[model samples]
Target: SIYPPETSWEVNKGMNSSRLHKLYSLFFDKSSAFYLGDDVSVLEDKPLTGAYGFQSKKNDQQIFLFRPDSDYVAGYHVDAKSDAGWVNDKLDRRLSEISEFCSKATQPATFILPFVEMPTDITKGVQHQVLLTISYDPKSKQLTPTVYDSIGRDTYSESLSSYFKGKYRTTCDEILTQSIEKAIKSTDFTLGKFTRAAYNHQNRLTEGNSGSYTFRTIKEVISSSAQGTEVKIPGSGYITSNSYLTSQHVQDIESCIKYRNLGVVDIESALTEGKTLPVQLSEFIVALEDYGKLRSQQSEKSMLNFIGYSKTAKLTAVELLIGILNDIKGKNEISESQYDKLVKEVDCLMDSSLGKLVQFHLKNLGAESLQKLVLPCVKFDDTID
Candidate 1:
């Protein structure tokens, strides 16, 4: 049951006294009919669950505690009484087109060519190049013909404007999302006012509720509350994840995890459950794929993020070893034997098939790179590699 067998009167502690009294009378002393603003005469329609109203002990107060309004970008509306328009065709049409475009460009493609200027005493010959990233927003439902000049680190490329046949300019600080959202205004459609009170195991609201077929009501998409709500695409089609989830998926999910404090999981685990590997290790996996290639990126004034992963296994350990080495280096002094224990921690990475592959790179870097990390005054039986 969505509601309980017995009801209890409880007010949120946040409500003050004057507001509290009006709230108590808002339900208990109210007339049989309820008025939801001047717009609606009465509520006669079923709610999302088919049942029209909520029951509160001693009739609760409408203190505007709930937002009552919910806006959704990827959400679909369900309707009762009519079933002809079960699908939001426009939304479906737009989304289908979006889903397809997104599939192809799961990873935003980049044109990374070397650009050199010959020093004719006018320009100094440099050994470096620049890039301009072209990002598409099919969800925004507009031709992203021009969105701020594509930025890639410090260097900027101008070739994209000529290719896309649009002037490439960059000044947007507004959040960009291909998809848009719509608001579902709060509407009242109840039969009348109802009260909530439960004493000695009997309920007044439960009689018609149980046999009401409330849960069994037939519902369909009559039409979109979002009719004409979608942004005017004004264009035919275009813009961009999942794995077989590619590295780009990794980059996106890595981005998701970073900004939202989320964590990345394997494709299988991302959907199904029963992953035996503990969270520490699973997170360790992402920390590898995300941290390694992007490893050099943890600090500094860096701004941009790029998106990956099968071969990421090797890099994970490379990053893992770097972490192990640093674990003992900072904050405390280490004895020779204690330092070996630190190296022993890294030695654990060699236990897995992926880890085994990772050790190969570690050893290769171990000689040249790992050797330098060891304490100058301390020596051990184990080789740095």
Candidate 2:
């Protein structure tokens, strides 16, 4: 249950008296205007309205005054006392000077001054408070001014200034350093001199060709063997087999296979350590082959059941088979018709449930296609135990 708190009438009475005293001091000259029973009257000796500020018939008089809020009040009072207008004039000229200064200085930066009323329970009878705030962005050259209401809410708002077409520049070295840091943190491959050189060359090619020949060459290079296994240059020390499909001349093919297999092992280690899926296509195929070798110790039904749930294992096997087929095709190890038929059969196996599931999952995760069914399809007899 909630209940309202009691009010502080005593504190309110003191605050009201203080406010009335300050207002009276600002509007009425002490020598001329003296208290006379609930109202003020001019002294008879002073000539009425003789060029020294006159009295008005109205009950209340308006006097512009500044109240710098609690945060700045100490400094404001000190400055006001130091000025000589403390005795000669009824108004606090120091406070007026400060107000004028603020108004003029704040115009360029969109400054805002506002006041608000407070509850007696919280403020102890303080009726109002002022807030001074300024927010600006020099880079964008924008400014705004605002005023608050009795409850600390904005009552007036305006954009004071704005400038367009501002420009700022940073050094190339800074940009490069940030880019390198980002790439190092996000990419699997680490940056080195060779990698940087390759990136620079790729950028140059892309810029010159507008991404046309850049992608064309990349497709050709990736689809063909990095080992130069399917490149032929006729009449230039080029023979059909030795130049285009030579086993001895194939560059980095064996090394690439070794590294690829090593990568699969690394992935298995990482995934298993992290309690994630350890049966990705690369790792699964090797596991399946190992299981096949150990089949003599296990039942055929058990092996089949395990394989059914191991989509990665199946896909891995297909990928290995495809790599083998690619080699065979480049080397002319089989006739064209035989290669075509084998490829068709591999494609059929890939479209099966296990193959399609693996492909779909990898694709959804932004992984490249791992179609390695070419070898198994072509050399099915050799693969079947």
Candidate of highest TM-score: 1
lDDT of 1 by residue, 269-294 (tens): 32122122122222333334543455
Q: Give candidates' CA RMSD values in order.
A: 26.5, 37.9
How does model 1 score by TM-score?
0.21
TM-score of each: 0.21, 0.16
Query: In model 1, where is the ten-residue run with the lowest total lDDT?
Result: 216-225
lDDT of 2 by residue, 1-385 (tens): 1111111111212222122122122122222111111222222222211111111123221111122122221111112222211111211233233223333331222122222223212223333332222222233333222221112111224211222111211101122223323323432322232111011111110122211121122222222222223312222233332332234222122111111123333322222222222223443334224333333344343255534434444444455554443554455354344554444545534453334333433443344543333323333345332
TM-score of predicted structure 2: 0.16
**Model 1 misplaced regions, further than 4 Å:** 1-74, 78-333, 342-345, 353-385
